[PDB]
Design an enzyme around this catalytic site. Structure first.
Site, mmCIF file in Angstrom:
data_model
loop_
_atom_site.group_PDB
_atom_site.id
_atom_site.type_symbol
_atom_site.label_atom_id
_atom_site.label_comp_id
_atom_site.label_asym_id
_atom_site.label_seq_id
_atom_site.Cartn_x
_atom_site.Cartn_y
_atom_site.Cartn_z
ATOM 1 N NE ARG B 47 -0.453 0.683 4.908
ATOM 2 C CZ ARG B 47 -0.920 0.829 5.920
ATOM 3 N NH1 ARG B 47 -2.254 0.736 6.120
ATOM 4 N NH2 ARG B 47 -0.344 0.851 6.987
ATOM 5 C CB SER B 51 6.240 -0.052 3.025
ATOM 6 O OG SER B 51 6.496 -0.417 4.492
ATOM 7 C CG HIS B 106 4.881 -17.512 9.347
ATOM 8 N ND1 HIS B 106 5.973 -17.999 9.880
ATOM 9 C CD2 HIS B 106 5.506 -16.163 8.997
ATOM 10 C CE1 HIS B 106 6.978 -17.343 10.085
ATOM 11 N NE2 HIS B 106 6.643 -16.140 9.487
ATOM 12 C CG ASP B 189 6.074 -21.411 14.043
ATOM 13 O OD1 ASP B 189 7.267 -20.921 14.388
ATOM 14 O OD2 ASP B 189 4.951 -20.494 13.597
ATOM 15 C CB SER B 250 31.166 -26.304 37.351
ATOM 16 O OG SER B 250 29.845 -26.309 37.870
#
Lengths: 324, 324
Positions: B47, B51, B106, B189, B250
């Site tokens: 959109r 970005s 996904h 997942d 340890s």
């Protein structure tokens, strides 16, 4: 508690002091070399053998444990915890003189009194929170590993100055020092490794791997989803806490985290942790560990072999070979 | 299942395909940049906004979601889970043609059928097991991030080749591929992040921190003992499994691990995990996530504000500041 740095080391209490690092394992090597590089006068006290010659090869005046203790003002014991008592009674205790300082990196043996140092000798702690190789490399690249310091007994009045100046000499004061006590260091460290960092974590991973594979899911993917992907999450927590981690994962993962975390780790689990803490405070764990050692490590034997047979450990090994 | 590499990418099925990456977050940026560096024909659908302009700045032919979908043969949806459904119905579904392929990283929305893609369109998955900046940067340094691939519906017969060539294009086949299904990726997942990696882990750390601070121990050392020191433990597990970790610590720590781990993570905890898994399989977790989003994230809001008030987060932020 307020964190402390090089500016807070008021006295250079190791100046002019003959220093003996007992042991030349990863940790002894890092401590001795760091101090030498910083300016201090360091010798080494080991059994004859591999470590001895490597210490001489490294340029250190090396001796037995006893003669290095005789020559020394400050003796930092970095042998393995399980042989410190025997090593101390046989080789160290007969060679201490009043006004010496005896250091440790772990409080276990002094706090639980398996070793008792004469009251005219200082006992101090510098506990760097990293492995020997990292304590050496971060110093070999002038910063360091943060550390805890503490004093168990202060005969001379200089014990805290010696502990802080030790932490200065090994690089830890460059990044941060936290004052603690022998009791708090011992009990918080045993609890953390038992309840969260090593026991809780490995048992949490193993339980999730079992749920998936017993429900029929592919063990290779289960390995990724309970183990391999953990490094990313823990790195995020290390750098920026829960908040940074929960910002970077998806909103679906984040919401499942808030919703299902408390269903898995419940109040009962917190109770179970309290019973773990209680057995650290009351000495029962320490006695169980030392008893197991004296019996020839039969519990440790069974544990280590069962752990080598775990499906997750076999699947995990193969996948790690397949991903160089 | 066995691990596959570039060698097993039999057909370069993205050859000659116009490719749209939907979303230009970190995941979209990584996938699109790697594929373009790999020489694929990549446009960005997103959109208008920052970005949109950051993509145009980076040299991408950049269109609206609907217009990019129309131009593309292969459409990889990398918008956030919570909006994929609305975004797909409004902008993507109208512009699909027979023989297109639709991708996800996904499986949540396809597996739970919040999104249904026409039966003459392929649905595939390439799911790198790392965050976007890591998928991008490892690609630049000559390797990559391992990935899962799957196919939900294969209309053309090329769906699987398209998924493997996508994983090859973004760098994943350099390291290793694992084939899965949409159902298994989604369910493993979700369970991994909820029961072990995110939820279990943070609740474990928090229960431990509470036990220590309620017992009176200094909060700053407790931070080191249940959180800061975990990075080293998990790095050792990442590189060499429980075996390497247990060799490196340890014997006291290792003993405490075997002894206290199963006291903290009991059979009941494993039963708690099974109920977590069941709500993933029956769709209840999925519906609760989506219902919370539809109602304006009110549960997520509360959770996030509670997380910000945790003492361990306040004490961790101070200590992380004090240790730059």
């Amino acid at each position: 508690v307020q964190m402390e740095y090089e500016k807070d080391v008021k006295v250079a209490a190791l100046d002019g002091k003959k220093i003996a690092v007992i042991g030349y394992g990863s940790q002894g090597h890092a401590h001795a070399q760091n101090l030498r590089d910083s300016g201090r006068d360091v010798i080494i006290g080991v059994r004859p053998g591999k470590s001895f010659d490597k210490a001489k090869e490294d340029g250190f005046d090396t001796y037995t444990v006893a003669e290095a203790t005789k020559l020394a003002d400050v003796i930092m014991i970095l042998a393995p915890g399980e042989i410190q008592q025997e090593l101390y009674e046989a080789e160290i205790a007969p060679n201490l003189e009043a006004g010496n300082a005896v250091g440790f990196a772990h409080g276990f043996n002094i706090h639980f009194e398996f070793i008792k140092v004469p009251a005219d000798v200082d006992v101090f702690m510098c506990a760097p929170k990293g492995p020997g190789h990292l304590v050496r490399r971060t110093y070999e690249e002038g910063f360091g590993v943060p550390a805890l310091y503490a004093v168990y007994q202060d005969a001379t009045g200089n014990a805290k100055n010696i502990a802080m100046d030790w932490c200065k000499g090994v690089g830890a004061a460059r990044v941060g020092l936290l004052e603690t006590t022998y009791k708090e260091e011992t009990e918080e460290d045993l609890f953390g490794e038992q309840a969260v960092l090593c026991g809780g974590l490995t048992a949490l991973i193993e339980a999730g791997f079992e749920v998936l594979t017993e429900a029929g899911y592919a063990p290779e993917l289960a390995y990724f989803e309970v183990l391999h992907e953990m490094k990313l999450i823990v790195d995020l927590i290390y750098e920026g806490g829960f908040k940074k981690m929960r910002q970077s994962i998806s909103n679906t993962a984040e919401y499942g985290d808030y919703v299902s975390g408390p269903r898995v780790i419940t109040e009962q689990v917190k109770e179970n942790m309290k019973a773990v803490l209680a057995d650290i405070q009351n000495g029962k764990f320490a006695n169980d560990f030392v008893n197991d050692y004296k019996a020839g490590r039969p519990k440790l034997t069974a544990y280590r072999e069962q752990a080598a047979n775990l499906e997750i450990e076999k699947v995990g090994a193969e996948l790690r070979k397949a991903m160089p």
